[PDB]
Amino acid sequence: MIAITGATGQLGHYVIESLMKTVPASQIVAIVRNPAKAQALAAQGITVRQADYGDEAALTSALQGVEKLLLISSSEVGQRAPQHRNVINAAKAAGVKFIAYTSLLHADTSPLGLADEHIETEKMLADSGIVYTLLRNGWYSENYLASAPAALEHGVFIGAAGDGKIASATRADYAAAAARVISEAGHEGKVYELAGDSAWTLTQLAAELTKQSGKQVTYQNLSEADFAAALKSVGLPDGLADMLADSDVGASKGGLFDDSKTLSKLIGHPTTTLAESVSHLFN
Numbered sequence: 001m002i003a004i005t006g007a008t009g010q011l012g013h014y015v016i017e018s019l020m021k022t023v024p025a026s027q028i029v030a031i032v033r034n035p036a037k038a039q040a041l042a043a044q045g046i047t048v049r050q051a052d053y054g055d056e057a058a059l060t061s062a063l064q065g066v067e068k069l070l071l072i073s074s075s076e077v078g079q080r081a082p083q084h085r086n087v088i089n090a091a092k093a094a095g096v097k098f099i100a101y102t103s104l105l106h107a108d109t110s111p112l113g114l115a116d117e118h119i120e121t122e123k124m125l126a127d128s129g130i131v132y133t134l135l136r137n138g139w140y141s142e143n144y145l146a147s148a149p150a151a152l153e154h155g156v157f158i159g160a161a162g163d164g165k166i167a168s169a170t171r172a173d174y175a176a177a178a179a180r181v182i183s184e185a186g187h188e189g190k191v192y193e194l195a196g197d198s199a200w201t202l203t204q205l206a207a208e209l210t211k212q213s214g215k216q217v218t219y220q221n222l223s224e225a226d227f228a229a230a231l232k233s234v235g236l237p238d239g240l241a242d243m244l245a246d247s248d249v250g251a252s253k254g255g256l257f258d259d260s261k262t263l264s265k266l267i268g269h270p271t272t273t274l275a276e277s278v279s280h281l282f283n
């Protein structure tokens, strides 16, 4: 029996659809905090167990019978470690035999500040005494593409990534990889550096963006301080602008680049290209 946290999130939703191609709904257990948002999962045969992430006891009850657990990291970036602390201890007590975790590409060496909470979580895993696998996801192409409209309307794309190379991949790609790891054998104890088969600069993004839209789009490389202040300028939560600007700087440092091709070789086919993703904007 396999269990999965964050099943109601964008990545998890895909993990589940992916898993359901080869796994009977019943053999899947979605540990969610709010079953109200688990409408779809219920309408598929998937088991849903409620568990407050800040509640180890509830997490332990929720992990009963679970042989393999996918810990889709928490989106509550800021108090994530304590949450994953609870989850890992619940698993130990419940007797989970295998845990796969979504971390960050090259976590231990990444220049991005987002690596922090993941590193703490990777340590706890090392400490758990439970066999585990690190699914170090690189950047979701859908992140930058979230600013596709703003760049199309206002004419240009901005950031602080310089010439850094982002080997992005879709959420569906990473979810498939997570799906294989938790369902198929031969993927325990591994440290997978998952990323796109290709990489691209923010400028290649603008050029690709103008090539398909027709309208012009230039890339304006700003400094970190600039970029940050730039987001809040159009009214953006400080935390966000900060993290966002830090990540771009982490990318300018090559922290989002990897060319191991672990992702495609793992999902058994080529990862989704930026060209195809960009295409969706005009689906």
Ligand SMILES: NC(=O)C1=CN([C@@H]2O[C@H](COP(=O)(O)OP(=O)(O)OC[C@H]3O[C@@H](n4cnc5c(N)ncnc54)[C@@H](OP(=O)(O)O)[C@@H]3O)[C@@H](O)[C@H]2O)C=CC1
Pocket (backbone or CB within 6 Å): 005, 006, 007, 008, 009, 010, 011, 012, 032, 033, 034, 037, 051, 052, 053, 054, 072, 073, 074, 075, 076, 077, 083, 102, 104, 137, 138, 139, 140, 143
């Ligand atoms: N490598 C990369 O490029 C990126 C990595 N990420 C991170 O990767 C993970 C996956 O992505 P995605 O689906 O897009 O993110 P989402 O925000 O869509 O998914 C978040 C999930 O974690 C759960 N969760 C968060 N807080 C709690 C809590 N206190 N108790 C129980 N569950 C909680 C569920 O929340 P709910 O019910 O509210 O849906 C939710 O499904 C995320 O958790 C996120 O932190 C995010 C963007 C980019």
Ligand SMILES: [Cu+2]
Pocket (backbone or CB within 6 Å): 276, 277, 280
């Ligand atoms: Cu497509």
